[PDB]
Amino acid sequence: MQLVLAAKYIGAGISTIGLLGAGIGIAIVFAALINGVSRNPSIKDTVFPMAILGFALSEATGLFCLMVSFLLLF
Amino acid sequence: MQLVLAAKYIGAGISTIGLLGAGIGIAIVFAALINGVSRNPSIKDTVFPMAILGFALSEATGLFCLMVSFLLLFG
Amino acid sequence: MQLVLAAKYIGAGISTIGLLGAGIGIAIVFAALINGVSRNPSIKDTVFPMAILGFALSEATGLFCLMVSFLLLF
Amino acid sequence: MQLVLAAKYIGAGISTIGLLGAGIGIAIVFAALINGVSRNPSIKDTVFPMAILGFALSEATGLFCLMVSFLLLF
Amino acid sequence: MQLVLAAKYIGAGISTIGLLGAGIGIAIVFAALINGVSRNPSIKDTVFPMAILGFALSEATGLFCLMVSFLLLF
Amino acid sequence: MQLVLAAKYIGAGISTIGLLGAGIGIAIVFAALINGVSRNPSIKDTVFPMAILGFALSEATGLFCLMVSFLLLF
Amino acid sequence: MQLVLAAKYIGAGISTIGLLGAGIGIAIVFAALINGVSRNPSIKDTVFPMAILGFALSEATGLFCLMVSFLLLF
Amino acid sequence: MQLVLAAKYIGAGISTIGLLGAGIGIAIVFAALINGVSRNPSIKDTVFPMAILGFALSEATGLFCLMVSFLLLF
Amino acid sequence: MQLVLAAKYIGAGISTIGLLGAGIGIAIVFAALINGVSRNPSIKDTVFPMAILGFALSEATGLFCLMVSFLLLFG
Amino acid sequence: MQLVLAAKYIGAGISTIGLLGAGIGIAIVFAALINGVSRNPSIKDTVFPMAILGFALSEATGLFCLMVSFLLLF
């Protein structure tokens, strides 16, 4: 039991590493948004929803990691 | 069996690392979509389905990682 | 209990790795803000709130990592 | 026998890390497709098959990782 | 007690890895500042406070990592 | 013998990590092909064999990794 | 006591990994300086102090890693 | 002897990780070749041998990794 | 003492990983030098010493890693 | 003795990881060379020696890693 519980807690920590992808990815989306709007302000209403979609889908990958983390913790 | 169970849980955690690739990749596809549309608004309806296809193929690599994770946790 | 405690401490250290994502991502958002404003100063009031949202969402991924770190430590 | 089985499951998990390469690579290919079509719409029919080939070859590297994973798992 | 002490020291070392994110991110912010000012010198007074804010927020992520490191050490 | 067998399986898993390099690299080559052809369609027949060569050489690095993996497995 | 000393030396080694962030970040800052001066030589006196500040702040993150390393070593 | 052999196998797997550098690097060289030729077709005979040298030198680093892998296996 | 010696050698190996940062950083500085000079040849004598300073500061981070490596191997 | 020798061989494998930096760095230098020459062929005699210097210094970091690897192996 002790070794199993120890493994769950180590595993839970490892399972958060993948969240770095969402941290970087969300930023990449918002950087494109800002750069696109600066170059062409008239396009903002068109590209803003694309940025929200892009962020949500990138974020979902990190939430999958967190899902595994919480299964191991709890 | 305690060693094997321990290994399943460590392995499950390690199996999620590869999801960082889809996290970054999905973002890269959507950034190109945004920059392409900002440069040439008329192209939107042509490139939007390319972005959907690209996101889905990138995401699938992460879903393979997650599949292995769930197999280790539950299988 | 000592083995479980050892694992909680190792797990907590591992759980901070993912914060590198927010470190880089917050920077990527601010770089875009700066480059966008330099190229088109008149867009500043439009893109500044986009940068704030972008950084907040990227930071949230790192805060998720830190939450797991603190759950393991406490 | 338990040490060997433990090794197989740890090894299977490690074998999925390389899939991050295909996750990023497939995206890089599709980003180029989108940017190329945006800059020169007439080139679409020419560059689309290149993107399909690029994606397939990048994905193949991740499929090799997953092959090793399943060999270790089963 | 030896096991717990060992884990604190390994955990503390691991807890510093995330600082690479701030190392890179702080640089990305200042690179943007330099490139933006080189392209449009008149914008310097507007973008400089943005760079200070961006640096501070990226640096904070590395400080959270170091916080965990010091908690494990002391 | 259990220890050696265990190490072969963990080593085999570790040996696949390097394949992420080819995953990314193959994509970088094809992205360049797409962007170069979009900018200058007349150059397609000249640069296509360059892309095939570049892909093959990047892929070779991942094949060396997989070679070690199979040696450890079999 | 030997397990604890072993942990300190393993931990000290791990504590240097984060220095890669400063290695890359310092370079990113100097790359921007060089490119900015090349594009607009007259801006040299303005951007050079920015590069010095950027380098110092990026390097500081690596110095924090090295601090933990030496704490663990000695 | 079994513990030493186990370590040689684990070490051999670890020694292939660095090949990811050549996987990416060879691609970066070929991407430049393709983009350079697309922008200036007349430069092809000048930059092609530069690409060959570039790829050879990047590949050498991966071959150094593979050498250590083979010394550990043999 | 065998455990401690073992740890010194593993730690020494791990201490070299950070050198990848200087490997990449030195390259980034020289790439900027090359691209800057290609775009504006007259600037060469101004930016060359900036590249030397930049390379040296990036390299020093790797030399800190190596210092820890040697301390673990020999100290 | 057995555990010490095992540690040397694992350490030797780990010591090659850092060579990925030189694999990528050497390529980055040669990519700049190729792109610079394509944009401005007349500059080739000036920038070629800069590329050789840049490659040598990037390569030196990997040779430092290899140095440690061979000390551990032999």
Curated annotation (Swiss-Prot), chains A, C, D, E, F, G, H, J:
Subcellular localization(s) per the UniProt record: Mitochondrion membrane
Residues annotated as transmembrane: 14-34, 52-72
GO molecular-function terms, A-Z: identical protein binding; lipid binding; proton transmembrane transporter activity
Primary location: mitochondrion
GO BP of this protein: proton motive force-driven ATP synthesis
Membrane topology of this protein: Multi-pass membrane protein
Family matches, as InterPro entries: ATP_synth_F0_csu (IPR000454), ATP_synth_F0_csu_DDCD_BS (IPR020537), ATP_synth_F0_csu_sf (IPR038662), ATPase_proteolipid_c-like_dom (IPR002379), F/V-ATP_Csub_sf (IPR035921)
Signal peptide feature range: none
Mutagenesis or variant effect for residue 57 to V: In oligomycin-resistant mutant and cross-resistance to venturicidin
Keyword Transport in annotation: yes
Keywords, ordered alphabetically: CF(0), Formylation, Hydrogen ion transport, Ion transport, Lipid-binding, Membrane, Mitochondrion, Transmembrane, Transmembrane helix, Transport
Residues under site feature: Reversibly protonated during proton transport: 59
Location of N-formylmethionine modifications: 1
GO CC terms of this entry: cytosol; mitochondrial inner membrane; mitochondrial intermembrane space; mitochondrion; proton-transporting ATP synthase complex; proton-transporting two-sector ATPase complex, proton-transporting domain
Similarity comment: family membership: Belongs to the ATPase C chain family.
Subunit-level organization: F-type ATPases have 2 components, CF(1) - the catalytic core - and CF(0) - the membrane proton channel. In yeast, the dimeric form of ATP synthase consists of 17 polypeptides: alpha, beta, gamma, delta, epsilon, 4 (B), 5 (OSCP), 6 (A), 8, 9 (C), d, E (Tim11), f, g, h, i/j and k.
HAMAP family in alphabetical order: ATP_synth_c_bact (MF_01396)
Main function: Mitochondrial membrane ATP synthase (F(1)F(0) ATP synthase or Complex V) produces ATP from ADP in the presence of a proton gradient across the membrane which is generated by electron transport complexes of the respiratory chain. F-type ATPases consist of two structural domains, F(1) - containing the extramembraneous catalytic core and F(0) - containing the membrane proton channel, linked together by a central stalk and a peripheral stalk. During catalysis, ATP synthesis in the catalytic domain of F(1) is coupled via a rotary mechanism of the central stalk subunits to proton translocation.
Protein name: ATP synthase subunit 9, mitochondrial
Species this protein is from: Saccharomyces cerevisiae (strain ATCC 204508 / S288c)
Gene expressing this chain: OLI1
Swiss-Prot record, chains B, I:
Keyword entries, A-Z: CF(0), Formylation, Hydrogen ion transport, Ion transport, Lipid-binding, Membrane, Mitochondrion, Transmembrane, Transmembrane helix, Transport
Main location as per UniProt: mitochondrion
Signal peptide: none
Marked site (Reversibly protonated during proton transport) residue numbers: 59
Residues bearing PTM N-formylmethionine: 1
Matching InterPro entries: ATP_synth_F0_csu, ATP_synth_F0_csu_DDCD_BS, ATP_synth_F0_csu_sf, ATPase_proteolipid_c-like_dom, F/V-ATP_Csub_sf
GO biological process: proton motive force-driven ATP synthesis
Superkingdom of the organism of origin: Eukaryota
GO molecular function, one term: identical protein binding
GO cellular component: cytosol; mitochondrial inner membrane; mitochondrial intermembrane space; mitochondrion; proton-transporting ATP synthase complex; proton-transporting two-sector ATPase complex, proton-transporting domain
Transmembrane regions listed in the UniProt entry: 14-34, 52-72
Compartments where found: Mitochondrion membrane
Result, substituting residue 46 to L: In strain: DS400/A3 and KL14-4A
Membrane topology: Multi-pass membrane protein
Family: Belongs to the ATPase C chain family.
Subunit structure: F-type ATPases have 2 components, CF(1) - the catalytic core - and CF(0) - the membrane proton channel. In yeast, the dimeric form of ATP synthase consists of 17 polypeptides: alpha, beta, gamma, delta, epsilon, 4 (B), 5 (OSCP), 6 (A), 8, 9 (C), d, E (Tim11), f, g, h, i/j and k.
Function: Mitochondrial membrane ATP synthase (F(1)F(0) ATP synthase or Complex V) produces ATP from ADP in the presence of a proton gradient across the membrane which is generated by electron transport complexes of the respiratory chain. F-type ATPases consist of two structural domains, F(1) - containing the extramembraneous catalytic core and F(0) - containing the membrane proton channel, linked together by a central stalk and a peripheral stalk. During catalysis, ATP synthesis in the catalytic domain of F(1) is coupled via a rotary mechanism of the central stalk subunits to proton translocation.
Protein name: ATP synthase subunit 9, mitochondrial
Gene of this entry: OLI1
